[model samples]
Target chain A: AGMFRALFRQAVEDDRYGEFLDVLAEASAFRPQFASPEACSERLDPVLLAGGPTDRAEGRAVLVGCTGTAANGGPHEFLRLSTSFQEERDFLAVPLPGYGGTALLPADLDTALDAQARAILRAAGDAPVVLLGHSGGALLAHELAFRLERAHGAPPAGIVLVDPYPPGHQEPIEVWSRQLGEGLFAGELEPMSDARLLAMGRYARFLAGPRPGRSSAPVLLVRASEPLGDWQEERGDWRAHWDLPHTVADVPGDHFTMMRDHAPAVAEAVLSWLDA
Target chain B: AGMFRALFRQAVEDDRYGEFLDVLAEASAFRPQFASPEACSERLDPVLLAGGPTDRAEGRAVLVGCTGTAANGGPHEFLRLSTSFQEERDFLAVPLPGYGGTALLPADLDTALDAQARAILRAAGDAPVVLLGHSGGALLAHELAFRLERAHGAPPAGIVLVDPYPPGHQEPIEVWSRQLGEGLFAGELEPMSDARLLAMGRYARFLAGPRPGRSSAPVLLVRASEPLGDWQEERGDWRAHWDLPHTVADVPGDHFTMMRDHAPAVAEAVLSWLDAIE
Candidate 1:
C-alpha cells in the first residue's frame, strides 16, 4: 500500500519500480476476478495529475470535476472556493480517468477510482487529505472513502461533497453518452469513453442507493440547494445513511451555480467546518 | 495589433477569446472569398500558446511543434528541452492546429500559418521572442519569418529550427488523414475535418517550393545529422534556399533525437546565438 509513493515519479524519471505492477498486484489480491486491461500495463503506473505545487504543503486537496486542462489546472473556475477556503493546501485536479486522453484507467471503476484516490494519498503520505468532489465527482469521493477504509482502514481527513444534486431529467443513456462529447463537456473536459460513461451511470445509481454507515472522518455536504425532495425525508435519509457527524450548509444557486455564485459563502462554511 | 496583450489572457481567463478572431478577419479581409470557419469566432482572438512567465529581461522562448496532447496537452515529451535548456525561460508548445484537439485552422495554409505567426507575434508584443519550431513546425517557423517581416516588419528575435527537412513524402491523403487519428494523435488532439487536412497537404506542397530570399533576423539551424540523403543537394538546397546569417551546430542525434539527446548542446548553441555580440 505504501509502495505507491516510491513508484509514482521515480518510475517516470528512470523506470524505477513502476506502480502498475504494484497496482495490478493490489487488484489481484483485492479482486482476483479483475482482468488486466492493456492500459494498466504501461511501464510505470502513471499518476493522475502532474506538475503542480501540491508537494510543498502538509495537506493535500484533490479537486475533481469541472476543472480545465493543464492551462489553468488547479481548482480553476469551478473549485475556486476550496482554493480560497483552504490554505497551505496542495491542490490536484483529477479529471475523469474514463475520459480519453493520456489519462490512465484501470479497467473497472472500482480499481480506476480506487487507484485515483490512492495516488494522491500515496503522494501525500501521513499528510492530511481532502477528497473535494463536485457534482459527479462527489460519488467518487464517497466511494473512495469506503475504498480507503477497506484498504488502509482510514477514510480521508475529510470529504467535501460540493453540490451533488440533479435537476432530474435522466436523458437516455445513449443521449447522455452523446452529450458527453457535445456542449455538456463545453470543451473543458476530455471526451469520455462509452465504457467509462457506463461505469459512471452505475456510480450514479450507487449515489441514489441508501448510504449505510458513517465514514471514519467527517463529511461536509455543501448542498447547492435543499433539493426538490421532501425536506425531512431527504435530510433524514442522508443522516440515516451516513450516520456520520456532518455539517450541511446551503450556498446560493442550484446544482451548477450554488457554490459558484456564492463560493465565498461556501468557502466560509467549509472553513468553519474544517477548522472545527 | 498591440492591444493583443490585455486581450490574450482576458480571453483565456473567461473563455471569451480562444482563437484568433483577428486571424479570421485578417484572412477574410485579405481574401474576401474566405468563408469564416465555425471554429474561429471565439471572443478572444486565440494564440496557439499562453500562460508562462516570459516578460523578464533574460528572454522568452516559444516552442511550436508537430506535437501531442497532455493528459490535457501534446508534444508533452518533446519540449522538455526548453525546461532544462534554460530555467526561468517562458516556454510554450503549440500543437499542429490541423491535427486537432480544439486548435482552430483556416481554409488555406497561407492564412492558417500566417495567422499562427501573427497570433504569437502580436501576443509577445515588445518582449524579445524566440520561435523554436520542430520538424514540420520548422517549416512554419521559416515561413513565419516571412509573415512577420511583412506584418510586423521583423521576424522573431531568434528562429531555432530543429531537425527540419523533407523534400517529399505523400502517403495517400487518407493516410496523412488517418494517422491524424490512430497513432499520430492517440485521441488527445482534436480530429481535423477532411477539408482541414486537405488544406494542410497544400501547405506541405508550399513548403517544398523554392525560397526567394532570406529571413530578416538570425537563424539557428539545428541539424540532426544522426543521417540523410541527396546529401549535398539537400543540404545545399537548404543552405542555398535561405540567404541569412546562420549558425550550424550538430546535436547528438538525428531528426528524432536531434533535440532529445543533445538538448544541452542545442541549448548552448541557441543561448550563444542570443547572447552573441551581433
Candidate 2:
C-alpha cells in the first residue's frame, strides 16, 4: 500500500529500518496459539515450569515475572528459578512487550503495559497472581499491580520488587553509564534487535518518570546486601527504601547476582512476604 | 564534563548530534528572565495580550495554552489569539516541554507534563487557571488536568479542547501522511531542529496512546465548522464526539483555521464556558 511504502521509505532513509524489519519478522511469528477471549488479544507465551498447575484450585498462584533491561533480561532471567523454586507457586515468566519472544509490540509504553497486562490476566486465568519484577522489572511489577488493582478491584495477591530503584529516582548520566558498564562486565549482554532495544529505551524513559499514584498492593521490597558499584560509598546504603508502606528483606548478593547466583534467597523473600 | 563528553560521543557515533547541538544552542539562550519560584523551575515565556490581567481580581483566569505538532504549532499558533481575543481571560501561551522557547527539555512525557504543570501553577499563583489545547495539546491538557486534580484536589475552572482528536483515536499511516501534506501546503513548515522534531514525534506517540482515566475538569469541545481534508467524506462528520461529557460549539473554520482566523469564535466559546465558571 502507499502508506506502507512511504513509512518504509522514510524509515530506510532515516537509517531506522533494522528495527522495523525485526518487528515485522516478530509479528509474522504471532499466531493465535494462546489468544485471550476478551478483545481476542494475543496472549503472551510465558515460560512455564514443567508440570505447573493449570487451575487455581491447585493452590497455585501465578507468580508472573519481568526482568530489567540489563544483560540477563526477559524470561531467560527467570529460567533457572522456574525449575529450582521450592514454593507452591507456578512460575509464569511474562516478558515485557518487546523482549523475549513476545509478539505484540505496541508503540508507546502505556499501550505496551496495557497489552502486557491483558496477556498476563489471560495467562493467569482466575488464579490469584503475584507480580515479581527484578530491578527495572520491579517498577514494571509496581505499575502492573496498579492496573491489576483497577481491573480486579483488588490488588494482585502480592508484589515482589527485587532491588528496584525507588520510583522517580533521578540518577545522573554517569550513574546510567556505570550501570551499563556493570551489566557489560558481569553477565552476557544478550543481543537484542535494534527495534527491541529502542523499545526498551522508551520503556526505561517512561518507567523512570514520576509515579504520583500508588498501588494499594502488599509489597515486599527485596534488597541486595552488597553495594552496587560505588552506591554504598557515595550514597550510604542502597538497601530497602521505598516511598510506599512495604516489608523489607535482605538477600545476600549484589543487584545482578540477587536474581542470578542468589535466586533462591530472592525466592525465599518473595514466598515469605506472600505468607505474611 | 566526562559524562557530557561520553553522551556527546555516543550521539555523534549514532549520527544523532545535530539535535543535541540544536538543544545545546537553545539551552544557552535560557537566561533566568521568567523563571518559576517553586522548585526554581524555568517558566515558559507566554505570548500575552496587551494590558491583560496581572491579577485574578481583574476577573481573569490564566488561559494556559498548547498547540498541536502541525505546521503552525507552538506558541506561534497562539500568537494571533493573544492579540485578537475579545475575552476578559488572560492568555498564557505555555509551550510543551520541548517546544517553543521552553528550556525544560525533560527526557520523558510525564516528566515534561509534571514540569510544565508545576510551572503553570507557579505562574498562576492564587488565580484559577484553565487549560486550552489545540489537537495534541488537548491530550496534554487532559493528562495535566489529572495531575492538577491530584495536586489541588479540585479540577481546573474549565478546559477548552480546540479541535482535538478524541483521546486515543487511531488512524492508518495514510491519515498521518495526509495530515502532513495538509500542513506542508497550507502553512510554512517552520525549520525545526531535528531534536525538536524527535521530541514532537515522541509526544505524538504518547498522545496517541490510551487515556483510561478521565479528568473531571469541565470541557468545552470547540469543533471546527469545516471538515479536515477527507475526514468528513471518509468517516462521516468527524466532530463533537468526545469520550467524556462536554459542551460542543462549532466555530466557522477548519481545524487549523479555528485557532487562527476564527480565533474570536474560539475565545467566545471559552468565555461562555467560564461564565459557567464561578
Candidate 3:
C-alpha cells in the first residue's frame, strides 16, 4: 500500500489530473443542452463521448461540434446517413465551451474553443484525426487546426466545414435565432442555462468581429444552397483565409436546415475530401 | 439568437451544469467500471451527483463512495431503501477516485478524494452538510472533515461510518471484491479495464492504512452483525480517532449484505445521531 500510495502521489504530482476540467459534463441527463443558467452553473467540465471502436488504433474521423448549438447525437446523424463516412469512420463529438455539453467558460469564445481543442487531443489518442465544424463552427475548425499544430505537433488530417457563416457577418444570426427557434427549432430548440449563454455572449464581439490568424490544414467548404435569409444572398468570402488545398461543395438546404435536409450531400463532400 | 446565446454564455460562465454521475449510470450501458488505466486517464475528473433538491439550502447529508470499488447506484440504494433519506433529503453523492463513476486517478486516492470534496462543496452550495462513508470511505470521511475545516474553514455536520475496516488490518479485500461483484453486481464486473484494477490494487495497502488524524465532527459507527469473514469478525477500533460525541449501532447483515438487507437500520442509526447533534 505504501509503495502504491507513492506512485499515486507521483501521478498526482505529474499533473495527470489536468484532464479534470476536460472530462466533466458527462451524464445521461446531459442531453440536448442546459435547461437554465442556474442548471449550467452547478456543472462545468467536458466529457468524451464514445465514437466507433473504443480505441482508435486503426484511426478514425474526429468531428468537432463547432456550432454554439451542438449535441452529443447531433453530428452522429451523418454516421447513419452518409455512405462515405460509413467506410473509415470514427468520431469525436466535441462540445464547444458555453455551448452543447462542454464546460470551460473563458472570457473569449476563442479561448473557450481553444480549451476544447486541447481536450480533443487527449480524446483523439493515436488516431490521425480530422476537424469538422458547421456555421460559426467553421471559424472554430480553422482555429482548432492552428492550435493542434502549435501545441500538439500537427493539425487534423483536414477540415470539413458545413455551411460556415462568412467571417464578419452575423447581423443575420439574431434574425435567424428568432426565426429558426420557431420556424425550424420550434419547441425542439434545446434550452440553455442563462449562465452558459451569458459566458459565451461576453465573447460575441470577438466571435463575430475579426479573426486574422489563418490555419494551414486543407479546408473544404460545404455551403448550403437555399439561403436561410436575405442576408446570405451576398456572402463574404473566406477563401483568402484558406491558405492550403481548399475546395467548396454545394448542399441542398439553407444553413439552419442542412444538418437534416442535406446531410447526405454534406457527408459525401466530407468523404470526398478525405479520399482526396 | 443574441438572447439565446447570451443565456448560454451566462449558464456556461456561472458553471451551473450538474448531471449527478450516479444518475448517469442508470441508463442501459453504464456498467461497473473504470474501463482501463488509459480510460482513467482521458477521464480524469470528479462528477457531483445531485441527490434530490438541486439547491442544498437546508444543508443535506452527503455520501462518499470512499472504497475504490464505489458505484453510481452503489450507495443511492439507501435513497430508495431508507425512509429517513425521504425527508428534506438533498444530497450530493461523491464517487471515490478510481471507483464508482468519479474520474480521479490522481497521484494517490487521498488527493483524488480531496478533489471530490472541493467539487462537492460547490455542488452542495450553502446547505449545512454532513459526511457519510462506508468501509475505507470511513477513512475518507474522517480525512475530509479535517481538510474541509483546515482548508475550507468548515467541517461537516458530522461523519457516519459503516463497518469500516480497522486501521492496519485489511487482508481480504481481494476476497470481498470477488464475492460482492458476483452476488450483488453480477454481470457488471467485466466492464473495468485491467489498468484500473492494477492502479487500485497498488493502493490497496494505503486503503488498509493507519489514519491517526482525529476529526472534530461528531462520529457514528454502524456495524453489521453477520460477519463476512474472520477479518471482519476481529475488527480494529476507530473510536480513538473519532474525537467527539461518538456512538455505535449494530444491524443484522454482514458487511456487504447490510447495504441491501439492513439499510433501514443503518438509516435509523444515522438519523438518531443527526437528532442528537441537532
TM-score list, all predictions: 0.34, 0.43, 0.37
lDDT of 1 by residue, B80-160 (tens): 466554443445554444433123434554565554555565556566667676665666676766666765576667777
Question: In the order shown, what is each candidate's alpha-carbon RMSD?
Answer: 20.4, 18.2, 20.0
Best by TM-score: 2
What digit string (tens of lDDT, one per residue) describes model 2 on residues B154-271? 5677788876676435342234444443453346454443334434545665665565667888888888887665664556445535666468888998866787788878887777
On lDDT, the candidate that comes out on top is 2
True contacts kept of each: 0.00, 0.00, 0.06
The CAPRI-style docking tier of model 1 reads: incorrect
Lowest lDDT block of 10, candidate 1 chain B? B23-32
- Cα RMSD over interface residues, candidate 2: 16.7
Give the per-residue lDDT of model 2 (tens digit) for A1-276.
111122333344444443333333322222212233233234466666523434445655668886565423555678766665533577787766655432434444455556667777777788788888877788888887887677546478888888777644534223444454435334555444333443454566666567555788778888888765555356444454566647989889877777678888887777667767
Assess each model's interface with DockQ, reporting 2 decimals per model.
0.01, 0.01, 0.03
Q: Per-residue lDDT for A9-86 in model 1, tens only?
A: 223343322222222222222111223433442222223332225445544444333232111122344444545534
DockQ of 3: 0.03
TM-score of chain B of 3: 0.64
